[PDB]
Design a protein around this ligand. Structure first.
Ligand code: AV0
Ligand code: AV0
Ligand code: AV0
Ligand code: AV0
Lengths: 55, 181, 181, 181, 181
């Protein structure tokens, strides 16, 4: 649901849990939430149609 | 430095009545302790903060991790050791003109104490080895970092040699003590 | 530097009538104060402006903050201290040739004054500690920045040792005073 | 440098008939002027061109602006001052053998002149202060630039101290001049 | 360094009864070994860690590969050699002040042993040459790297010359041994 501004990584070759930063961590959150909402609306409409039509 | 002042002071301080063991002790402290520190010493620890590098971009991690790893360089410790060990024999210059054996006893016991204390402090500060890796977790460094050391094999030898000499001198001091009552 | 001139001048200045306490004071000032500064001193404060770094890109923020943090290095303060404390004993070289006890009193009181003043100035300038962080708010630097220090644990020891020696010498001077009337 | 040659030469030049005031003047010039320059001096002005930086990319602005700000370092001015002030007393080595009080008068006059001239030159060259900012408008720099200085508080002290010593010596010289006629 | 202390100690240690071969040995150790190390030596090995570079970006490969290639610089090995070889003759002062031939035998034996041991150690540590390439496979370096050396032709000469001198001295010591029984 969100995108933070700090990630701690411990992968090779990185030595022992270094820190890494991020770019534009606030537009991506908005875009996430927006698309989630749209997809939910589509889900609801399809469900209502199926019910109205189905047995 | 200026090691000639100490030379002249000593040359004026050794005109004192002693015994075989005191002369042996003076010989040992003069050859294996001074002539090594005066000549071979200053050039090993001259590039200790310049070739010490950590793996990070944070300004202020190298200084902190150095000060945390080597709070005091060995060479200064040994210089102080030499001076404080030779003092009780320098006080004779002051005690002489006053009159113009008891003092022997006092000197001996104080030398025992100083030597033992310095050996113990040496074991508790540095140890027996100097490795080529350190892990540092002091502000501003981020949670831990690896820091690398310079010439870590040419200092271990010094450490061991000095430990041996100190042990020998402690033994000789105790021997001179038991020869007293 | 050239510390032999001082050696010869002193060796010619100590041919004076003194008492136990004056000789003890001379011994202390000679061993625990000079021989340390001459030998162990110059190499600690040699990389003080080169390893001092602040967190900024502004040109001229390191020089200002340095000058604001360490306006005067410790070693030069101590050198000046030594010279000004030894002067009254040097004036004898002149008084004697002029005459070829009162002077004793004058020397004593002046030594008292100088020692006390220098100890107080030491407490008011530097303090008891040297930390590894400084906050700077002096032009050209932007309102406030952080600046880091080098070897902040090897200078605190010097500070403390010198404070102790100065205290002891003040005590001895006052003792010699009360022995006068 | 080699300050022992001067020591020996002087030690062979002071075997001359003088009075209280001449000896006081010699003492002052020897303690507060020579021992300060020999020991504390050479090390302050060692990083004067390396830590002087201007705010520009033009190659050749730092050199020009330095040469325009500090045409001559203080320490060499003071060395020259010392030598030229001690000269009239060295010429006794040459007059002695040739004779194997008039000379006294000539010495005194020339000492007066040299001391006054050097004090006035000090006033007109450097001043009473050393600031941490300079404005430079010399080719190749573009019409003006700010240039920053290193250790601007450790040199003001030297300036003031030397001004005071010079004033005292001028006073003593005039006192000796008003003692003959 | 301060090589005058050794000079005075020796000048006081050679007032001993010897024979042709001891004097020849002293001459050789004094000319071809001391005067070469005091003057020409300290300046060749001053840029040994600063001009040693490996082909990699990993921080901490140069220090490790250096410490693995040159664990100890030749010059300090030779200094130690000189001191330990001259000791048995320095130990005559104490015996002299004590008595105020057997000793000759003991000195000779110990000199034989020390010389042979140091020659063999030289063979086993460094060798007969110093090349301009090294292959390093020590952490943190990745599985291998080439590392390049500075002035690799000015040190081979020193090595060879010192090997020759040591051989000659061993020969002379054995010759003096067979002269007794
Ligand atoms: C880095 C600087 C280190 C400083 C190194 C300075 C070197 C010291 C040299 C040795 C030294 C100090 C003590 C040595 C122990 C330490 C060994 C050092 C080992 C270092 C490698 C001996 O010191 C003696 O110790 C005696 C102790 O009993 C003492 O005797 C006292 O006990 C009584 C009982 O109470 C007491 O009442 C009373 O007051 C004393 O009778 C003597 O007074 C004292 O002179 C001083 O050297 C003395 O002077 C010369 C130069 O040496 C040397 O040669 C001279 O005589 C030769 C006649 O043939 C001949 O050559 C020449 O005429 C001449 O040249 C002397 O022979 C030597 O004696
Ligand atoms: C880094 C720069 C520091 C330089 C350090 C220089 C070392 C100084 C050495 C001590 C020193 C200065 C004062 C010491 C106090 C400070 C202690 C320092 C401690 C430092 C660790 C003593 O000074 C004496 O002080 C006396 C004060 O009363 C004074 O006596 C006056 O009181 C009257 C009352 O009015 C007054 O009227 C009148 O004028 C005086 O009668 C003497 O004239 C004066 O010589 C000078 O040393 C003197 O010379 C030799 C070398 O020492 C030493 O050995 C010599 O004699 C030995 C006979 O066996 C024997 O060996 C040899 O024949 C010979 O070799 C002497 O024994 C020593 O005396
Ligand atoms: C950085 C290098 C600086 C160099 C520093 C060198 C130190 C100088 C020491 C003082 C000094 C120079 C002048 C001092 C003024 C400047 C003060 C300096 C202040 C600095 C802190 C005095 O100089 C004297 O000046 C007199 C002026 O009148 C002159 O007298 C002339 O006037 C006549 C009238 O015409 C004229 O005809 C005629 O020719 C002279 O009769 C003398 O000949 C002359 O010797 C030379 O020192 C002399 O030698 C020894 C060592 O000092 C000192 O100790 C010795 O005697 C003691 C007997 O107890 C005793 O200890 C010992 O036996 C012995 O050891 C002497 O006592 C001292 O005298
Ligand atoms: C980097 C530091 C190195 C230090 C270098 C110091 C230089 C040493 C100089 C040589 C040296 C040390 C030994 C030399 C061997 C090593 C060669 C070194 C080669 C280096 C390039 C000789 O040493 C002698 O050795 C003899 C051994 O037998 C010994 O004799 C013993 O045997 C007995 C049997 O038991 C025994 O009982 C008993 O005790 C002794 O009788 C002597 O006592 C001893 O003095 C000391 O020098 C001595 O003093 C002067 C200065 O030299 C020199 O000139 C003086 O005499 C000249 C009369 O014309 C004339 O000029 C002048 O009056 C005067 O000036 C002397 O002539 C010279 O003798």
């Amino acid at each position: 649901f969100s995108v933070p501004g700090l990630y701690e990584c411990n992968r090779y070759p990185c030595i022992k849990e270094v820190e890494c930063y991020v770019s534009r961590p606030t537009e991506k959150t908005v875009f996430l939430v927006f698309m989630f909402a749209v997809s939910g609306i589509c889900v609801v409409l399809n469900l209502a149609e199926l019910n109205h039509l189905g047995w | 430095g200026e090691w000639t002042i100490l030379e002249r002071l000593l040359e004026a301080a050794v005109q004192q009545h002693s015994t075989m063991i005191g002369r042996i002790l003076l010989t040992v402290v003069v050859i294996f302790r001074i002539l090594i520190v005066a000549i071979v010493g200053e050039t090993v620890y001259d590039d200790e903060q310049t070739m010490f590098v950590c793996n990070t971009l944070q300004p202020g991690c190298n200084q902190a991790c150095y000060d945390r790893a080597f709070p005091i360089s060995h060479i200064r410790y040994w210089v102080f050791q030499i001076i404080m060990v030779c003092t009780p024999s320098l006080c004779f210059i002051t005690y002489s003109v006053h009159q113009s054996s008891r003092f022997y006893i006092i000197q001996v016991v104080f030398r025992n104490a100083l030597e033992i204390g310095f050996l113990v402090g040496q074991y508790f500060l540095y140890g027996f080895s100097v490795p080529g890796l350190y892990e540092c977790n002091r502000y501003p460094c981020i949670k831990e970092v690896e820091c690398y050391v310079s010439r870590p094999t040419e200092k271990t030898v010094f450490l061991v040699f000095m430990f041996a000499v100190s042990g020998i001198c402690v033994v000789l001091n105790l021997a001179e003590l038991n020869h007293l009552g």
